[PDB]
Design a binder for this molecule. Structure first.
Ligand code: IM2
Length: 640
């Protein structure tokens, strides 16, 4: 039985080498070329597998049900079932069979062309025909296009019809000034090594009306992905890029001639958007007549995907950031629909997917404000806005009396001398501060004191009812929000800092809109939702209903009171509840401290919408509040 042991080993070593793509090592386990031995030599077995398995992009060959028996005295017969992955899907239940050879102290495989595919004879060919699937569309809550396939106007030049000598320089300057192009860049395009004097050298895509075409300029229609909102939704949607040979090795079911999502929803929903390649993989005669069809099915185009996004709100939210670093999240807080996910600054996804220069791409990467960051999915310290949560927790466990008045003298405060030179700082020197006053003026010292009075254990008990540590069901890469680095603060200072939204808190804007939704649902947290068809999910009894009825009237005062931190929003004349905030940061970079500005705002009459905006590393006298009027006007009109 020691012979069939070595035969089973030989067959599995042969299958392993085929699975790994080392066709040479597989061929060197075959017998000499003869009639009842190997049908081909080693070098032509190599080329057989390399051409056929390479044409169909075979990957992941694995066998089962291996039986090795005895035929003659030195001839052992094997058989097994097998499956493999190709460019047209998985190929299952393949019945392979053959014979072995025990000559000296080694066993080899009598190779036959039926060990490539079952039922191949001598000189049979393999044919593969494919039809590429059309990529699906991404559309908003009202069916407007966010990412669609269609026809684009491609501009290029033919160096021959452009002219020579001084005739050339005049036309090149005419092209460069008629389409906003660098005169030195048109020459670098026509000077590339691939160019022949008569070829059409593409230059850029024209996304509007095309002016007069000077001599040598041409315009050709071409199919390609198009993003109608451009940079206004680049971080969310993403972009597609040309598929590489290294992508095909990872997943053979891609179209080597098509596009793959590189970031954003295009990448998160690539499998649903790309569809499936249609076609047929068949074995033919030495002539070419069809012997057996191995795989065949029709092309299935990609499904469309409907988002909760509002295209008008998304554009308004992004424009309001004015190219500064920041982000804005808008929801309908009773259902969790994500109306807008803006991040700024941004990149051009149309320029990204239609070929971008090395310099322009580096300008994006070297940009200190980093336009590639999805800021709506990046953990930040929430800032003073978080005082709402601490207050609601304090009202639930009875630590905070809404009418008790703390007496605060000055702008700085510390628990005792053990804090050293550290002090909680506030902006307004109000002496008598109750809860309503602390929310109107945004008083850290009040919140820091009520947090320390509450204590860590009661503070965390309230915080644990939220979504810290949870993974939201969203097709957006993000990390779970955290209260702090460890399970305990181990610091009175860190406890007070966390009270008014500083410390080691990390919560991204989407997770913030989820937590703050309790004030629009009588203490019920409503999870955010991006896919329009999905069902609303929530989480009851996060904070008490009594706390909501207490805090929301005070949040109205943040807008209506003449000294409220959001009083500029009272100009809108719409029912508003708001809370502004500030987070001071930086630690191991520059000496000057950087400041983040926050705004939370929702309609407290109908709970129709909710907004969380931020400015990262704000310039002086800039704030999220002074930029929010236009989006609030829109959301109030169209989402009651
Ligand atoms: C949080 O409540 C902040 C505090 C942590 O800085 C306070 C201060 C601000 S206003 C910005 C003053 N400059 C530097 N701190 C408010 C606010 O309502 O924005 N809350």
């Amino acid at each position: 039985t020691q012979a069939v042991e070595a035969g089973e080993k030989t067959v599995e070593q042969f299958v392993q080498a085929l699975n790994k793509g080392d066709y040479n090592k597989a061929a060197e386990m075959t017998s000499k070329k003869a009639a009842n031995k190997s049908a081909l030599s080693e070098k032509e077995i190599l080329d057989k597998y390399q051409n056929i398995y390479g044409a169909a992009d075979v990957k992941g060959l694995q066998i089962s049900n291996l039986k090795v028996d005895k035929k003659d005295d030195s001839t052992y017969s094997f058989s097994y079932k097998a499956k493999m992955n190709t460019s047209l899907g998985e190929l299952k239940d393949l019945s392979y069979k053959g014979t072995l050879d025990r000559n000296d102290g080694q066993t080899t495989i009598n190779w036959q062309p039926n060990l490539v595919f079952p039922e191949m004879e001598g000189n049979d060919k393999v044919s593969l025909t494919t039809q590429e699937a059309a990529r699906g569309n991404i559309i908003d809550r009202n069916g407007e296009p966010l990412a669609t396939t269609g026809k684009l106007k491609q501009l290029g030049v033919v160096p021959s019809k452009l002219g020579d000598g001084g005739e050339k320089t005049a036309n090149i300057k005419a092209i460069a000034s008629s389409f906003d192009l660098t005169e030195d860049a048109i020459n670098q395009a026509i000077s590339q090594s691939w160019v022949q004097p008569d070829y059409f050298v593409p230059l850029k895509i024209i996304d509007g009306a095309t002016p007069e075409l000077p001599a040598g300029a041409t315009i050709q229609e071409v199919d390609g992905r198009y993003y109608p909102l451009g940079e206004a939704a680049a971080q969310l949607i993403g972009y597609v890029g040309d598929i590489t040979a290294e992508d095909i090795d990872k997943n053979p079911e891609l179209s080597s001639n098509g596009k793959i999502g590189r970031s954003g929803l295009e990448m998160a929903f690539d499998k649903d958007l790309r569809g499936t390649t249609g076609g047929k993989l068949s074995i033919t005669d030495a002539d070419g007549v069809e012997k057996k069809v191995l795989i065949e099915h029709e092309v299935q185009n990609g499904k469309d995907i409907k988002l909760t996004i509002d295209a008008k709100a998304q554009k308004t939210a992004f424009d309001s950031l004015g190219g500064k670093a920041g982000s804005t999240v808008a929801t309908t807080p009773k259902t969790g629909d994500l109306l807008a996910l803006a991040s700024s600054p941004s990149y051009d996804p149309n320029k990204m997917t239609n070929g971008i220069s090395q310099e322009d791409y580096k300008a994006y990467e070297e940009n200190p404000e980093q336009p590639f960051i999805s800021r709506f999915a990046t953990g930040y310290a929430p800032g003073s806005t978080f005082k709402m949560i601490t207050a609601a927790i304090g009202l639930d466990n009875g630590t905070i009396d809404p009418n008790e008045v703390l007496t605060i003298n000055g702008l700085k405060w510390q628990k005792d001398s053990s804090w050293g030179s550290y002090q909680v700082t506030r902006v307004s020197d109000v002496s008598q501060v109750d809860l309503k006053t602390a929310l109107i003026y945004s008083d850290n010292i009040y919140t820091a004191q009520e947090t320390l009075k509450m204590g860590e254990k009661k503070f965390r008990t309230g915080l644990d009812k939220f979504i810290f540590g949870e993974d939201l069901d969203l097709p957006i890469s993000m990390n779970p929000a955290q209260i702090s680095n460890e399970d305990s603060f181990n610091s009175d200072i860190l406890l007070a800092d966390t009270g008014y939204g500083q410390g080691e808190l990390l919560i991204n804007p989407i997770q913030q809109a989820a937590m703050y939704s309790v004030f629009a649902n009588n203490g019920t947290l409503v999870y955010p939702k991006l896919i329009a068809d999905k069902e609303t999910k929530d989480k009851k009894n996060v904070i008490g209903e009594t706390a909501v009825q207490t805090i929301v009237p005070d949040l109205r005062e943040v807008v209506q009171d003449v000294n409220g931190t959001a009083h500029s929003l009272s100009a809108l004349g719409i029912p508003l509840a708001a809370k502004t905030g500030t987070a001071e940061i930086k630690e191991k970079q520059d000496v000057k401290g950087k400041e983040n500005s926050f705004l939370f705002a929702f309609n407290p009459d109908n709970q129709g919408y909710m907004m969380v905006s931020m400015l990262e590393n704000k310039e002086d006298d800039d704030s999220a509040t002074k930029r929010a009027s236009e989006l609030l006007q829109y959301l109030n009109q169209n989402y009651q």
